Structures are given as C-alpha cells and as structure tokens.
C-alpha cells in the first residue's frame, strides 16, 4: 500500500477461484469515496489488451501463465492514483459483466513512511457509577498506510462489536474508534508496520 | 429469316436443320450500391466471445 509519488507498484489478482487463463479480466479502481472506474481489461489470447482512454500507456496487465496470476503495472504516480484497486472477473471468455470481484489491494501514495499505530485504551472511568449497560472499546490512531484490521479478544464475542470508518487529519494519517456493549478484549493489528499489539482487557 | 446454308445437301452429310434462336447481348446496366458487412454483431454474447 505504500509507494513514493512518481514511483511504482505492482498488483496482483487474488479471485483464486477457477483457472484465470479462461476469463475476461479487468482491473477496476474505485478512489476513496468515488465511483468505481474501470483501468484495462486482458483478453484470454494474452496480448491483446483494452485500455481506458486515459490511462495513455501508464497501465499495463500481464499474467504469470504458470502461476495463474494477473498483474497491474502502475509508473508515474500522483494523488489521484490513491485509491483501492479491484481485480474483476468478467463471467466470460469475452466481453462481459463480473460476476466475481476480489477483495481487491488498497494503494497509498504519499512523501510519508510507514507509521506504527497508537493504541489507546478509552473507557468510561471507574469513579463514575456503573449501569447495567456497560459501554466499552478501543482506539486506534497515528497511522499512515489506510488498512486496519480490529478484532477483539480474538473474536470469540462480536455481536456487539461497532467499529467506525477511518479518517484523515490534516497532517495525512488516519485515526478510528471501536466501541462494544456487555455485561458487567480488544487486539488491533496494522500489517504494513507489522504491529500486533493487545493490552488492558 | 430465310435460308442461306444449303440444308437439304447439309442434311444428306448427317447436319439435321435445328432450332432457330434469336440473339441477345447485355447491355445499359443498372447500377445499385449494398453494404456487406464480413463481421457479424456478437454484442449480446460478448461474454463467450473470447
Ligand atoms: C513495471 O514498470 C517498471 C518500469 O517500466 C519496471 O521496472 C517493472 O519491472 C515493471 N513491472 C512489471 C511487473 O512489468
């Protein structure tokens, strides 16, 4: 998810679920909080490629064809190109709509290097009286690579589990809040700084 | 149209007279343009296409 403005970086399909030689395949881009925008489709022959209008070259798709994979190649990167970055399937040989997405590789330019999350553990104090509704959870922030992952007590209660969408500050790192209900607990992981950290249950 | 080729002597070395046909030749032609179009439209099964 990290890469330099002006850089490069290179992409993978993750569908994994069939041989992906014998299907229409595109690459979809979708920006934070913006449509979906289709980048270049890969015919089953494997040279003859489709291409946006706007990409002019900048994109390029190749397969593995021994390790049934699909690559993106991405040069000359700016702000714009942040976005999450959609390997499609398209339910045919030919031309067609995808009936299959995969989970898709979120990308980060930015002059930023990858930051460790500050974990901070907010809870109603102890002084105050407790109430049979109890509210609790955690907090994540100062971070600069977009995903997180929060899990809580490995996961073994999440029917009251409540994690908020991330958000930037004027600085460009991002911060997010979970919050849980129960009776009268909680690991985040950040995988681009390799920080697994679970403290004060 | 008359006769000018001597059938009767013909008809003795095995020529027998046969059907008298007129002669015709094309000619002020008509001239109308199509479109042949060489590939077929698959748009509604672009996706066996391949
Ligand atoms: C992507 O392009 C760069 C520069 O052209 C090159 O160094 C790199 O090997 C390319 N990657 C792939 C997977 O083709």
Redesign the interface.
């Known amino acids: 998810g990290l890469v330099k403005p002006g850089g490069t970086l290179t992409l993978t399909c993750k569908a994994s679920g069939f041989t992906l030689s014998s299907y229409?395949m595109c690459w979809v881009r979708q920006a934070p909080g913006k449509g979906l925008e289709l980048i270049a489709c890969l015919?089953?022959?494997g040279a003859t490629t489709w291409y946006a209008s706007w990409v002019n070259g900048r994109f390029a798709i190749s397969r593995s064809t021994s390790r049934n994979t699909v690559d993106l190649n991405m040069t000359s990167l700016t702000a714009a190109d942040t976005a999450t970055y959609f390997c499609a399937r398209?339910?045919?040989?030919?031309?067609?709509?995808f009936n299959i997405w995969g989970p898709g590789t979120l990308v980060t330019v930015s002059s930023g290097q990858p930051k460790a999350p500050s974990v901070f553990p907010l809870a109603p104090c102890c002084g105050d009286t407790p109430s049979s509704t109890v509210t609790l959870g955690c907090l994540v922030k100062g971070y600069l690579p977009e995903p997180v992952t929060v899990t809580w007590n490995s996961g073994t209660l999440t029917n009251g589990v409540r994690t908020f969408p991330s958000v930037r500050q004027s600085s460009g790192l991002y911060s997010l809040s979970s919050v849980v209900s129960v009776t009268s607990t909680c690991n985040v992981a950040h995988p681009a700084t390799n920080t697994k950290v679970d403290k004060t249950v | 149209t008359g006769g000018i080729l001597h059938y009767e002597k013909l008809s003795k070395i095995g020529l027998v007279k046969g059907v008298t046909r007129k002669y015709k030749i094309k000619s002020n032609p008509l001239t109308k343009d199509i479109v042949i179009k060489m590939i077929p439209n698959?748009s509604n099964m672009?996706?066996?296409?391949?």
């Open positions: 229409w015919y089953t022959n398209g339910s045919g040989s030919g031309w067609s709509w | 698959v672009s996706q066996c296409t391949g």
